[PDB]
């Protein structure tokens, strides 16, 4: 378990993320998705 | 597009049927999320491919503070990965089990958050059909997050016929083989409120047939410690006739919810 993923390091990060939300709609929501029909196909 | 290498894997959060869920960090943004991994071969073998793509279609198009967000998804040779909102406080059912029952403040807050999320779904003709503690997670400040859409359906026109959900949560119309609509979720909200406050669902019985019987008779027996307000809300949701059930807006506006909810909306970008 890497340091960031436990104890005070995780808690700190989680709190920062709650109070400083990023634009997930642009950061991830705008990024291309594999078409649902191609999910069980080649990658 | 994303790949697994784009994430620091922290640790497993839970096991599932088709893969595990992991605490993960997206590297570029140092942004903490959950990564659900599903194995393509096991999904195909079990014959649940179209089930999964339905769940993904529904959840990936919902944006609400009380619905667990699916940011995106990707796949590689062997795996399908779902990038999900991390819910720091974990499983609501574990918290309920830990405490036995929730106090009125906790229960009322949850009910407001639930009614708001369900209203959002119904506005889009999505019926959930399996509201119960095990399908809810909790955010940083304990905010309810509808986490699982396993029985959910987009139902624009036709009323539905599938008996689904969980025994203790089934509405009379499902048990009786009638068609159902979005008002099934009103019933399940009433069952949920009762379970929040009592720690057991209202129609608890050792047999399927006795449970069925209590449901269709609405054999509701309120424990003495319940407030008049909580009983009022539950009674207004657990109506035999779907059209008589308190609407979701009605739950949000109910005086007991107003008086006891300490609901906080998460900061938005
Ligand atoms: C260990 O349970 C967790 C599960 C989580 C979790 N689990 C999910 C797994 C899968 C999932 N979606 C699907 O499986 C799925 C399947 C088909 C289509 C769409 C979604 C949603 C949520 N997501 C986000 N955050 C979570 C956070 C979780 O726990 C955080 C730890 C909380 N806490 C820490 C100390 O006190 C006790 C526990």
- E strand spans, chain B: 7-14, 21-26, 31-39, 70-75, 79-84, 90-91, 126-127, 136-138, 144-146, 153-154
B20 is in an annotated binding site: yes
CATH no. for A1-43 = 6.10.250.2990
> CB under 8 Å to B174, separation ≥6 — which residues?
B163, B164, B165, B180, B184
CB contact under 8 A, B32 and A14: yes
Three-class secondary structure of residue B21 per DSSP:
strand
Q: Which residues contact B222 (CB under 8 A, 6 or more apart)?
A: B231, B234
Any atom of ligand 1 within 6 Å of the Cβ of B252: no
Measured in angstroms, the CA of A23 and the nearest CA of chain B are apart by 6
- Nearest CA to B237 among B140, B135, B118? B118
Q: Are A40 and B44 in contact (CB under 8 A)?
A: yes
Q: Is the CB of B52 under 6 A from ligand 1?
A: yes
From the list A9, A32, A34, A1, the residue with the least C-alpha distance to B8 is: A1
Q: CA neighbours within 13 Å on the CB side: how many for B136? A: 26
Identified catalytic residue from B130, B185, B219, B228: B130
Q: Is the CB of B87 under 6 A from ligand 1?
A: yes
For Cα atoms B112, A24, B20, give the angle at the middle one, nearest 5 degrees: 80
B51 within 8 A of A8, measured Cβ to Cβ: no
To probe the interface with B, which of A7, A20, A27, A37 has the most B CB atoms within 10 Å?
A27
Residue to mutate among A3, A40, A42, with most B CBs inside 10 A, is A40
List the B136-138 sheet strands across, edge first: B90-91, B136-138, B144-146
Tell me the domains of chain B and their CATH numbers: 1-87 (3.30.200.20), 88-261 (1.10.510.10)
Q: Which of residues 20-39 of A touch B (CB under 8 A)?
A: 20-25, 27-29, 31-34, 36-37, 39
> Using CA atoms, how far apart are residues B130 and B229, in angstroms rounded to an integer?
25
Q: How far is the CA of B71 from the centre of ligand 1 (A)?
A: 14
Please state, in angstroms and as integers, the Cα–Cα distance from residue B199 to each residue in B97, B134, B139, B168, B226, following that order: 8, 13, 21, 13, 12
Q: Is B268 near chain A, with CB under 8 Å?
A: yes
Q: By the 8 A CB rule, do B252 and B225 touch? A: no
* Minimal-distance CA residue of chain A relative to B43: A40
Given resolution (angstroms): 1.9
How far is the alpha carbon of B98 from chain A, nearest alpha carbon, in Å? 21
- Does A4 reach chain B within 8 Å, measured CB to CB? yes
Expt. technique: X-ray
Locate the domains of chain A by residue range. Answer: 1-43
């Amino acid at each position: 378990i890497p340091a960031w993923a436990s104890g005070n390091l995780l808690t700190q990060a989680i709190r920062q993320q709650y109070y400083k939300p990023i634009d997930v709609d642009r950061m991830y929501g705008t990024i291309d998705s594999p078409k649902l029909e191609e999910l069980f196909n080649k990658s | 597009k994303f790949t697994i290498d784009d994430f620091d894997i922290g640790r497993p959060l839970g096991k599932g049927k088709f893969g595990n869920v992991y605490l993960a960090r997206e590297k570029q943004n140092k942004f903490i999320m959950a990564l659900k991994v599903l194995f393509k071969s096991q999904l195909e073998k079990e014959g649940v491919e179209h089930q999964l793509r339905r769940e993904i279609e529904i959840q990936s198009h919902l944006r609400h503070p009380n619905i667990l967000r699916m940011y995106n998804y990707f796949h590689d040779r062997k795996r399908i990965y779902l990038m999900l909102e991390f819910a720091p406080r974990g499983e609501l059912y574990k918290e309920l089990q830990k405490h036995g029952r929730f106090d009125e403040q906790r229960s009322a807050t949850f009910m407001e958050e639930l009614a708001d999320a369900l209203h959002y779904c119904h506005e889009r003709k999505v019926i959930h059909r399996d509201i119960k503690p095990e399908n809810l997670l909790m955010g940083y400040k304990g905010e309810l997050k509808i986490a699982d859409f396993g029985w959910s359906v987009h139902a624009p026109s036709l009323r539905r016929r599938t008996m689904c959900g969980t025994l203790d949560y089934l509405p009379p119309e499902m048990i009786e083989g009638k068609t159902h609509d979005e008002k099934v979720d009103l019933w399940c909200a009433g069952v949920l409120c009762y379970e929040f406050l009592v720690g057991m669902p209202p129609f608890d019985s050792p047999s399927h047939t006795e449970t069925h019987r209590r449901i269709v008779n609405v054999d509701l027996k309120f424990p003495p410690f319940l407030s008049d307000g909580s009983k009022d809300l539950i009674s207004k949701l657990l109506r035999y006739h779907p059209p008589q059930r308190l609407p979701l807006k009605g739950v949000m506006e109910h005086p007991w919810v107003k008086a006891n909810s300490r609901r906080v909306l998460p900061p938005v970008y």
